[PDB]
Amino acid sequence: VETIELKRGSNSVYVQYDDIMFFESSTKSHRLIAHLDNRQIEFYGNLKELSQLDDRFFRCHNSFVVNRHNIESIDSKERIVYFKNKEHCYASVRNVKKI
DNA sequence: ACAGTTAAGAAT
DNA sequence: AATTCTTAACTGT
């Protein structure tokens, strides 16, 4: 069991670490979006604390924390991180080396 | 180094 | 249970 509580104010949703492809910032202030296989969950959190949960969670961009276990491939020239579910996000110039 | 954008603290 | 203001730290080139 590697469970994370995604706190939502009137409720919480619980997911496994490896259900999560990546996290990004929401356009709602102080919310993030957890990208699961084919669902997304909005919750209260910050990307910094998620990257500190576990070494699989890597801060590849100011707006993205990726789950290394669910990365399918990486285009290092375009700085695109592709996930097993066929979503993608971006790594910043300063962080792309380290993924 | 630069001009523009944004994550997350403080308050409530 | 959510929202704004704020500003240091980030962004790509």
Short mmCIF file of C-alpha atoms (C1' of nucleotides) in Angstrom, two decimals:
data_model
loop_
_atom_site.label_atom_id
_atom_site.label_comp_id
_atom_site.label_asym_id
_atom_site.label_seq_id
_atom_site.Cartn_x
_atom_site.Cartn_y
_atom_site.Cartn_z
CA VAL A 1 0.00 0.00 0.00
CA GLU A 2 1.42 3.30 -1.10
CA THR A 3 -1.57 5.54 -0.69
CA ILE A 4 -1.93 9.22 -1.13
CA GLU A 5 -4.82 11.26 0.15
CA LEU A 6 -5.96 13.84 -2.32
CA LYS A 7 -7.70 16.40 -0.08
CA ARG A 8 -10.76 18.03 -1.61
CA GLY A 9 -12.36 20.18 1.15
CA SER A 10 -15.67 18.34 1.74
CA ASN A 11 -14.06 14.98 0.87
CA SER A 12 -10.82 13.17 0.07
CA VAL A 13 -9.97 10.76 -2.71
CA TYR A 14 -7.36 8.06 -2.12
CA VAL A 15 -5.13 6.69 -4.87
CA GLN A 16 -2.04 4.55 -5.10
CA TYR A 17 1.28 6.29 -6.03
CA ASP A 18 1.50 4.28 -9.23
CA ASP A 19 -2.07 5.08 -10.29
CA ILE A 20 -0.63 8.59 -10.90
CA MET A 21 1.02 9.49 -14.20
CA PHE A 22 1.79 13.02 -13.14
CA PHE A 23 0.59 16.04 -11.19
CA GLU A 24 0.13 19.51 -12.58
CA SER A 25 -1.03 22.86 -11.27
CA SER A 26 -4.73 23.61 -11.68
CA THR A 27 -5.91 27.02 -12.90
CA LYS A 28 -7.75 27.13 -9.55
CA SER A 29 -5.32 28.66 -7.10
CA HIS A 30 -3.80 26.21 -4.61
CA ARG A 31 -5.22 23.21 -6.45
CA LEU A 32 -3.37 20.51 -8.36
CA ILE A 33 -4.60 17.92 -10.83
CA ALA A 34 -3.55 14.26 -10.47
CA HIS A 35 -3.50 12.58 -13.87
CA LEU A 36 -4.46 8.94 -13.51
CA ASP A 37 -4.83 6.38 -16.34
CA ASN A 38 -8.05 7.89 -17.74
CA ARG A 39 -9.25 10.19 -14.98
CA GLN A 40 -8.06 13.41 -13.45
CA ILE A 41 -8.58 14.47 -9.83
CA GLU A 42 -8.49 18.05 -8.63
CA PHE A 43 -7.27 18.49 -5.03
CA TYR A 44 -5.58 20.82 -2.59
CA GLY A 45 -1.80 20.50 -2.50
CA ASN A 46 1.55 21.86 -3.56
CA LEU A 47 3.98 20.32 -6.04
CA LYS A 48 6.99 20.75 -3.70
CA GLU A 49 5.56 18.48 -1.01
CA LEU A 50 4.57 15.82 -3.56
CA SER A 51 8.12 15.70 -4.94
CA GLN A 52 9.30 15.08 -1.35
CA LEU A 53 6.98 12.10 -0.79
CA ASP A 54 9.03 9.62 -2.74
CA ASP A 55 11.98 9.50 -5.15
CA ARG A 56 9.67 8.37 -7.97
CA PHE A 57 8.01 11.78 -7.98
CA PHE A 58 10.25 14.19 -9.86
CA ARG A 59 9.83 17.93 -10.27
CA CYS A 60 10.63 18.15 -14.01
CA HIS A 61 9.10 21.63 -14.44
CA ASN A 62 7.72 24.38 -12.19
CA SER A 63 4.18 23.16 -13.08
CA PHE A 64 4.74 19.35 -13.23
CA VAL A 65 5.69 16.54 -10.89
CA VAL A 66 6.02 13.27 -12.82
CA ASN A 67 5.85 9.69 -11.62
CA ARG A 68 9.03 8.01 -12.97
CA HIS A 69 7.39 4.57 -12.74
CA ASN A 70 4.76 5.63 -15.33
CA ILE A 71 7.02 7.36 -17.87
CA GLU A 72 6.77 5.44 -21.21
CA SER A 73 9.40 7.47 -23.08
CA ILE A 74 11.12 10.85 -23.19
CA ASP A 75 11.83 13.13 -26.18
CA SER A 76 14.85 14.99 -24.71
CA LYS A 77 15.08 17.40 -27.69
CA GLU A 78 11.44 18.53 -27.49
CA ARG A 79 11.59 18.01 -23.67
CA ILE A 80 8.39 15.97 -23.75
CA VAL A 81 7.71 13.32 -21.11
CA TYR A 82 5.33 10.64 -22.40
CA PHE A 83 3.35 8.45 -20.04
CA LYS A 84 2.09 4.90 -20.27
CA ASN A 85 -1.46 6.18 -20.69
CA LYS A 86 -0.40 8.33 -23.73
CA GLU A 87 -0.62 11.69 -22.01
CA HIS A 88 2.40 13.93 -21.96
CA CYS A 89 3.83 16.89 -20.11
CA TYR A 90 6.97 19.05 -20.47
CA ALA A 91 10.29 19.17 -18.71
CA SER A 92 11.87 22.58 -18.29
CA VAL A 93 15.28 23.38 -19.80
CA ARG A 94 16.90 23.49 -16.35
CA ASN A 95 15.42 20.14 -15.16
CA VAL A 96 15.35 17.94 -18.28
CA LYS A 97 18.88 16.59 -17.63
CA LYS A 98 17.83 15.02 -14.34
CA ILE A 99 14.65 13.03 -15.11
"C1'" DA B 1 20.96 38.10 -18.51
"C1'" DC B 2 16.01 39.40 -19.69
"C1'" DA B 3 11.15 40.13 -19.83
"C1'" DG B 4 7.13 37.65 -18.82
"C1'" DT B 5 4.56 34.09 -15.95
"C1'" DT B 6 3.34 31.37 -11.93
"C1'" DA B 7 3.61 28.36 -7.42
"C1'" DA B 8 2.61 28.72 -2.95
"C1'" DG B 9 2.86 31.67 1.83
"C1'" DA B 10 -0.23 34.57 4.78
"C1'" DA B 11 -4.57 35.80 6.05
"C1'" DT B 12 -9.18 34.56 6.97
"C1'" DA C 1 -14.10 25.15 2.62
"C1'" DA C 2 -11.94 28.67 -0.64
"C1'" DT C 3 -10.25 32.77 -2.06
"C1'" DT C 4 -7.30 36.91 -2.79
"C1'" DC C 5 -3.01 39.47 -2.67
"C1'" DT C 6 1.69 39.02 -3.07
"C1'" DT C 7 6.54 38.19 -4.59
"C1'" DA C 8 10.63 35.26 -5.07
"C1'" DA C 9 11.44 31.93 -8.25
"C1'" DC C 10 10.53 30.21 -12.14
"C1'" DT C 11 10.07 30.08 -17.74
"C1'" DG C 12 12.46 29.80 -22.67
"C1'" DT C 13 15.67 31.90 -25.47
#
